[PDB]
Symmetry: D3
Subunit: 152 residues, 6 copies
């Protein structure tokens, strides 16, 4: 059903370096979304080139890959109603210049090349990103104790 | 005066159950509004039918009444300049899908049937709600120590 | 059972005036205690004299009663295992000079005659205080959604 | 270049009196802006009349000057990419009625004559305000340890 | 040398269920410890029996294993000077009855069988726990941008 | 009188670099202390050698002076009953290893040579430090709006 939608959220190396992991996770927990999966890694160049395969011809691509490999990331899957679209609202606009106060990027960063976090742009993108970053058995099935107070 | 306006705010059963009472009251205190009245109760079905009398023919009404009776609520009166309209802004849109990050519903909930909080929609509705939920003697008259730093 | 113990907590007029209501309630919610009752009132002199009957001959008593009547208080009942003794630890020592950082008094106040909050000193005192400050029907029976995650 | 832009931010006497200094500074730190200068003073009437010279014929001006002299302010300079315009977004609208939740004014104040904070409206105004409020040697040159994680 | 010490911290199923993951991580980040490894899983009964092999004859053991399997945990490795001993101080006493306000257990839980978090008790135990819970390649080597401001 | 006591608090260059200025100031404001003076500067080597004159023969002294000059500090004066001794409690032990959770050093740092903050050790030392670091005219006389709710 619609309440079982999932999105991929990654905290980028700048978000880890600037000590924002706990703050970001809290935002998702407090909203009522369910954490499905989480790991911490330095993504290989090859892995990142696959993640960003659509951008391989963009002028910023070599620098993007180097930056995304320049420290570890936190990779996550979150579940809930409209979590892809709502996750993007919670992150704010991709360019922090346009991100509103109250959003993750609006509160915590400045420049588009150092924009702390990624969220899937669509359900189709989410499922592709989840398959790339996680093994199926890393996605945990459990029920939140407050589920019936979050959902009708 | 305009600064003597009051609104009725109720934290719904899901807000209590999910441990948001303190967080919500803090939002109103830190803004500069004055807490006038507060009580904690399980509202009866008869009481809720009166509260929601305008909705009695809406298809969601029986379920709404049952949910609103399914645990305790925190009922409050807050005072301040434009507190009705500003209170509604602070809560966010009634549908959490449309509530912006930074608002109570935007930060803390997902689905319209579990939308954690109520605020009066108008001054007229506020006075009706205050009369329904509170005895006149339960509204306390005192002056905030910071009043002259909040108002010219 | 031991998990059904209750205590009386009151936020004193200075706690209300200094905008600490939300912060204090959040401390109790986040610990895993269940809010049973809550109301907001200006306690009469006669009421306060009964609450402080043991102190009626102490030199500070007239001033104590006047201060406790000088604005509204938030009166509450909280439930949980050892909530009386643990509640006192959470508040800190009655004299804020001796209250450790991390406690309510340690974090938020300075002087013993303006010590923001009261908690029952014993189960026997709690049951007396609960009877004095609340009508039986103001104590709400409900079960926390996270109860099985707070208690074995 | 663009990352070296500076703005003038002043916490007004109401923001000091209401205990918001730390909360406001934290908002600027967490965003990634660099604190360049800071001091705490009661601004003289003459000083304030110069700061507000463009408003000298507005009907609210005498009251504005009196209020701005009625307690100390925190005067600050912050540096970063688009810090003038982004600083203004973070503050919210000058009139708190229109300031969104998540912004400093939206979260913490109510009325235009008690609007807790000032930010420069333009780079040209910022440089004028910085010269008026600060001696050149009070602007400290240092590099943030996280600079390369905030800026590409 | 001493600054390279590591500990194993696990957020127990109750900590996940009660929405404390972000809050706990933030405590470690803000202190200056470096996150080395993190994953999210439901630990098997066999895995838990190995982790708790020293407790296998304690009367609470069967229930402990069931509870530790009853939802996912967040498993982490953290690095820094005296992180084992300091980590334990930050968590508080293993029995929440004795955990002081300001500690993780003191702030957020009540009963020993639902005590939200684990930390290694010694360096020897930490290295054993890290080997049990993590593959060597899951421990990420990077340098914190603030390392020279945390350590001389 | 006793409520007019003052102490000197400095946030050291590590506390500024790690983004803790807001957090530290908030701890003092929320306690009920009055901010008297504040400025931001890079203290000269000569100034620091005077501040630390008692330590001039200790083996760590050259490094201490270089670190304390290696970025800006926030220097402050705070007023209130027992503010020197209570300030020290709020900071925690000078050695962060021994600082309890809930204190500034306990929550936010690790090693003695990077211990984020200084507070005067005695009233005599406070008055000496205030004279060294501030001009008399930088200490602002104003009355907190909540004074009568903090003090009897
Ligand atoms: C920030 C990004 F990682 C985006 O996520 C992703 C695709 O952006 P797009 O397809 S335009 O839209 P989204 O759905 O992800 O917003 O490329 C990055 N990116 C975009 N523009 C720039 C730029 O000028 N400089 C640098 N350094 N990185 C940029
Ligand atoms: C959440 C509510 F309590 C509203 O606040 C209130 C008035 O709704 P409306 O007539 S749109 O007026 P405003 O609240 O915008 O002033 O009825 C509830 N409500 C509205 N739509 C729905 C729905 O689809 N399902 C369920 N379960 N409850 C709903
Ligand atoms: C603050 C208090 F309300 C205490 O909670 C309560 C019970 O006294 P006691 O049995 S010593 O306290 P606990 O061990 O239960 O905390 O009396 C008040 N109190 C105590 N000493 C003083 C004082 O010098 N001046 C003023 N103004 N109030 C005082
Ligand atoms: C709050 C302010 F300090 C404004 O920032 C500044 C410039 O006003 P404006 O020309 S509308 O420009 P922006 O702030 O949009 O740049 O005057 C103050 N101000 C504006 N309207 C009022 C008022 O009715 N009463 C009082 N007491 N102060 C007012
Ligand atoms: C909470 C624990 F996980 C301890 O960490 C661990 C080792 O306990 P111990 O030998 S006292 O060692 P430390 O905690 O001092 O390291 O056993 C658990 N535990 C202890 N007592 C009890 C109990 O009565 N019921 C339940 N359910 N779990 C208990
Ligand atoms: C951290 C300090 F600035 C102390 O505040 C101050 C006064 O020392 P003491 O008189 S023993 O402490 P308090 O009176 O302030 O409690 O010397 C510094 N200090 C002490 N031990 C060490 C050390 O091993 N390495 C380095 N790098 N700095 C140290």
């Amino acid at each position: 059903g619609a309440n079982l939608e999932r999105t991929f959220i990654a905290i980028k190396p700048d978000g880890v370096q600037r000590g924002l992991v706990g703050e970001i996770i809290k935002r998702f927990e407090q909203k009522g979304f369910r954490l499905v999966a989480m790991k911490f890694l330095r993504a290989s160049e090859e892995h990142l080139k696959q993640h960003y395969i659509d951008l391989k011809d963009r002028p910023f691509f070599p620098g993007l890959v180097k930056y995304m490999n320049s420290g570890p990331v936190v990779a996550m899957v979150w579940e809930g109603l409209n979590v892809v679209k709502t996750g993007r609202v919670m992150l704010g606009e991709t360019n922090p210049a346009d991100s509103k106060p109250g959003t993750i990027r609006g509160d915590f960063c400045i420049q588009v090349g150092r924009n702390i976090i990624h969220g899937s742009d669509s359900v189709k993108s989410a499922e592709k990103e989840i398959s790339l970053w996680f093994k199926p058995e890393e996605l945990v099935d459990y029920k939140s104790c407050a589920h019936d107070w979050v959902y009708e």
